[PDB]
Amino acid sequence: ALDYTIVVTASASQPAPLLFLAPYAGVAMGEYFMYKGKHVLVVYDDLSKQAAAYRELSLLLRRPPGREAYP
Amino acid sequence: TRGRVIQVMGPVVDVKFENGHLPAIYNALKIQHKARNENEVDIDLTLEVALHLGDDTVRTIAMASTDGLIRGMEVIDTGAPISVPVGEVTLGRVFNVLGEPIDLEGDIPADARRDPIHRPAPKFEELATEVEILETGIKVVDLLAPYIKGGKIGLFGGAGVGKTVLIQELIHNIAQEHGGISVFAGVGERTREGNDLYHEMKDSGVISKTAMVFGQMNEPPGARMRVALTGLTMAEYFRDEQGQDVLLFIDNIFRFTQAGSEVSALLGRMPSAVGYQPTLATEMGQLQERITSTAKGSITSIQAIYVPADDYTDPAPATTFSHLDATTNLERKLAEMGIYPAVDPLASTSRALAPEIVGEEHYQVARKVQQTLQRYKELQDIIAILGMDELSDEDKLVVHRARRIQFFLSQNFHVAEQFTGQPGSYVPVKETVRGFKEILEGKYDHLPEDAFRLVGRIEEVVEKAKAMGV
Amino acid sequence: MTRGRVIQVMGPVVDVKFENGHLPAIYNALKIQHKARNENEVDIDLTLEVALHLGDDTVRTIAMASTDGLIRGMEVIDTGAPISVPVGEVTLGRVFNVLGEPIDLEGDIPADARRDPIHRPAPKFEELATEVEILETGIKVVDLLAPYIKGGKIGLFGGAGVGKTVLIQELIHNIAQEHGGISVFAGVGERTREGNDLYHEMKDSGVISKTAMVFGQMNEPPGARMRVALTGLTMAEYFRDEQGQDVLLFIDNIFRFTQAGSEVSALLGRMPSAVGYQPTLATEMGQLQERITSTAKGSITSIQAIYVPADDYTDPAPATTFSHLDATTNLERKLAEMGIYPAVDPLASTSRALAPEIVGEEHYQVARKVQQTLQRYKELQDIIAILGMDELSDEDKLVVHRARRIQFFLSQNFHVAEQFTGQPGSYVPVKETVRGFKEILEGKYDHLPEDAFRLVGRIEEVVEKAKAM
Amino acid sequence: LLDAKASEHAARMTAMKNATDNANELIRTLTLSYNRARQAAITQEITEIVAGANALQ
Fold first, then answer.
1. What DSSP designation does B383 have?
2. Which of A14, C178, C255, C334 has the most beta carbons within 10 angstroms of its beta carbon?
3. Residue B227 carries which DSSP code?
4. C146 annotated to a ligand binding site
5. Which of A54, A59, A63, A70 is most worth mutating to test chain B (most B CB atoms within 10 A of its CB)?
């Protein structure tokens, strides 16, 4: 499968902004092929970890919490 | 006159003006910026003023993304809120939140009449003293959950239930029999479904009656906040000048509240009960008290609602159930039976169905139809498990009349002519009351359980049954 | 000089600034008296209780009445002491508010009367009572099944319609008859029409000439309702300390005390703890209920209605009261509709005192045998329902024929009900009610009809009601 | 057979009494769980509201 797929990784050892920007980097890589006429499938494995990374990302930037302390 | 940017934190933008020249609340502020070098990005924003702070600064809300903003860009004060084009110009067009056409049909010229978005609700003496009934031509709606001319309706449906087909036949029947323009205001719901709905507007041919406003999930919560209000100020032109009985479709008023909850935490407000903004009920009321029937006009409103996790005690469905007058509940099982529109006859309710409003005969016929369909609902497991040949008589009669009733509630729409071929029907309320009275009395128990499927009137039942069989 | 000046007013919370070094201590009282000098201003008489110190020579207070009209800059007078409440013989028969002022239209208390502070430390470890003495109420179902302690806390779980106020009036009557003990009522946050109904019932009863009442009712600010049980209790403490006698102290719905402190703490800006309760829940309840003790000179015993919010005993407001309770007396509606007065449920009313070391051996054996026979008779109800009265056995038929005599014998003729049924009513000592239930359980009074046992005082006068029928 | 029908109806009587008592004690333990979850829900919501208020001050 690795002659037609790209893998974007954002590990747990990587800081919270790299888990925050991982789906946007994946869908930018998808948009490059989409606006050329190709067909892209993008799989975001565990978006709830993106939500917790952005929750950390906001709470450390002194943004006010909301429900379950998400922004 | 001229103000510069101080803070950019996500959606919100703080702008400092010169002393004595502050803009009032809800004005539109514009940023037209051209990049002076290769280290900058061209910017076209519209900023809605939300708060006044102390030292000549103003906290605004962005209508688009704030990516690219530099602390120190000059901001143009327009001196008015977001002026939105109104008229017969807007019919058949698709708009932004700012009143700009997002379709490629053309630009609206600058000398056209533009109305501001924010205006007070109509007063106490300007409203209509009596309750009048918005006659739709749809038999589930006309019989079992009538629509107030000027009231607020709830559609509770997902996909596969033909919600777009029901929306289209509402627009078609109102613009056919009442001469009423409709307006679809899609507030933060699924750009794919918005495009499906626009191409079905184009195919149905009823689009030339509606005006469409889309601010979807992709847009910042200022745009999702103000889309319902710009669709509302497009409908209020037709009410306030043409006197018409205007429809107004808001797709998920829930999004009107949660976009405000996204905004208000950034505005600096203390959080409320469910994490929702403190100003939940007054913002929802300033939306849904402009949707009223005045003396010369009307705006009725059919409003889709996605209750999150089907939890009706959440503060935003509570605050918007405080304003509803009816519910139209689309079910998937009735769509699998073939019953179009798939309105659940027992769960869909209305404030109208009381004998002082709809009349006395209509009230007895609707309550007897509800009682026999409830009794057939109570026999669902018995028929499905134990069998049909074992119940009793005076209950086999109940399910016998209940099948003919729950198929006669379906219609052939004018919109489905391009898909089925039969030319559709508009059914008055007195004729469907007479038809359901005749089916309840037992006049049509010798006809089959087909020929009640997809017919308008009650004589079309026998005109179809003589074509099939006896 | 101790003259103050208002800075902030926001609801009940009022910030007052004094000069440096002339600050009021915490819990002091602040008299605001203002005569309006023009048509703009409004006349004000208003007392504040100091709660915090904010720095910058300021003081944050909570208000006892409405703060409407308070102007930034107006004069505040420091009393030099907390809220001084009149005590003595001049409080008997009089309805009072939290400030020690008479609600009644009878008159004013003169200024030379003794007034003692509202906030007092609890009586020390040196001064308490070593032993546990019994409190003899003269009610049989109380003195046999859920006995009281001098210095105790007792819970009423009745509600309306079961005769809670009838027990209140009879406990006042019996203690002031036999023990010479003044009672004090304190309605912490109760309906005003029910306060007036309670006052007219105790006036018609005649019990009032011996009690004292405090009503800080629901219309008053939370700073009043948090301090109302303290000013009933300060009236009780005079007769405990100076007079040396066994005093009652009724706190109606102490859940109103807990949530009054909760909303005071929410106004003061504190972070709320578990279940929305003020962080200081257990220590405010402790500062109330550790002054209700039995010292060497007298005692204060307390009977406290408890709300039981969303009817679970694990909510912190029932849970921090139940750690001070020494007894409970459940009032049940089906015993009042049956005809048993008082409506005390004999199986749900429990007591920490009901033990052979505290009470005695014979009382304990008779009381536990009464609970066993009533438990067996409560088990036999479905058997009587489905099998009928006959053909059970000889033994359980004797159990039913014994236990209905015990169940109807638990009702008394109160002295309170004399103006309603004409029967003079009786004080039954604890030795004679133990002897009476012992002689019923032996079977000595088994042949008498069961309607002789209803509404009768002791066992020597059930023979005469059986003789009259 | 009359003996067996009487014992049939008595056995179904006792079986449904035991099922009702089992359901009632299940209701009791579920209300203990409901009160625990109710208190925990209210304290969660109140600390999140107060934390969102303290974030601004």
1. I
2. C255
3. H
4. no
5. A63
Cα B55 off chain centre by: 42
CB atoms within 10 A of CB C262: 24
- With touching defined as 3 or more inter-chain CB pairs under 8 Å, the answer for chains A and C is no
Judged by phi (left if over 0) then psi (alpha if -120 to 50, else beta), residue B462 lies in: alpha
The residue type at C284: E
Q: Specify whether the CB–CB gap between B167 and B157 falls below 8 A.
A: no
- What single-letter DSSP state applies at residue B212? E
Is the CB of residue D4 less than 8 Å away from at least one CB of chain A? no
Answer yes or no: do A64 and D48 touch at CB < 8 A. no
C376 an active-site residue? no
Residue A15 contacts by C-beta under 8 Å, 6 or more apart in sequence?
A: none
Structure solved using which method? Answer: cryo-EM
Q: Which residues of C touch D43 (CB under 8 A)?
A: 273-276
CA distance B420 to C226: 74
Question: In a 10 Å sphere around its CB, with 0-12 CB exposed, 13-18 middle and 19+ buried, how is residue C198 labelled?
Answer: buried
State the CB neighbour count (10 A cutoff) for residue D43: 17
Task: Tokens for C238, please give them.
Answer: 């005079």
Q: How far is CA C244 from CA B78, C9, C174, C297, C299, in A?
A: 82, 44, 18, 5, 7
Tokens 């089916």 belong to B439
Task: Give the span between the Cα atoms of C170 and B137, in whole angstroms.
Answer: 73
* Count of all residues that appear for chain A in the document: 71
Token digits of residue C218 = 């629901």
Give chain B's radius of gyration (CA, Å).
25
Amino acid code (one letter) for C25: A
**CA–CA dist B381, C82 (Å, integer):** 72
| List of residues 6+ apart from B444 with CB closer than 8 A | B404, B438, B452, B461, B462
CA angle B22, B25, B30 (to 5 degrees): 70
Q: How far apart are CA C185 and CA C178, in angstroms?
A: 19
Considering only residues 44 to 63 of chain A, which have any Cβ-Cβ distance to chain D shorter than 8 Å? 62-63
Other beta carbons within 10 Å of C17: 17
Burial B219-228 (b: 16+ CB within 10 A, else e): bbbbbbbbbb
d(CA C348, CA D25): 19
| DSSP helix/strand/coil, A67 | helix
Give Cα separations from B431 to B40, B138, B451 (angstroms).
67, 12, 17
> Please, which residues have CB within 8 angstroms of residue B265's CB and are 6 or more apart in sequence?
A63, A64, A66, A71, B271, B277, D52
| Whether B22 contacts B58, CB under 8 Å | yes
Place of tokens 């578990």: C274
- Amino acid making up residue C276: G
Interchain CB distance below 8 Å, A65 and D56: no
Which of B218, B156, B209, B216 lies closest to B186, judged by CA? Answer: B216
Q: Which residue of A has its CA nearest to B270?
A: A64
Structure tokens at B431: 């004729």
**What is the rounded CA–CA span in Å between residue C44 and residue D46?**
36
CB neighbourhood size of B368 (10 A): 16
CA distance A50 to A19: 6
The answer to whether the CB of C225 falls within 8 A of the CB of C260 is yes
Q: Which of B326, B332, B267, B282 is nearest to B302 (CA)?
A: B326
Q: How far apart are the first and last CA of chain B?
A: 82
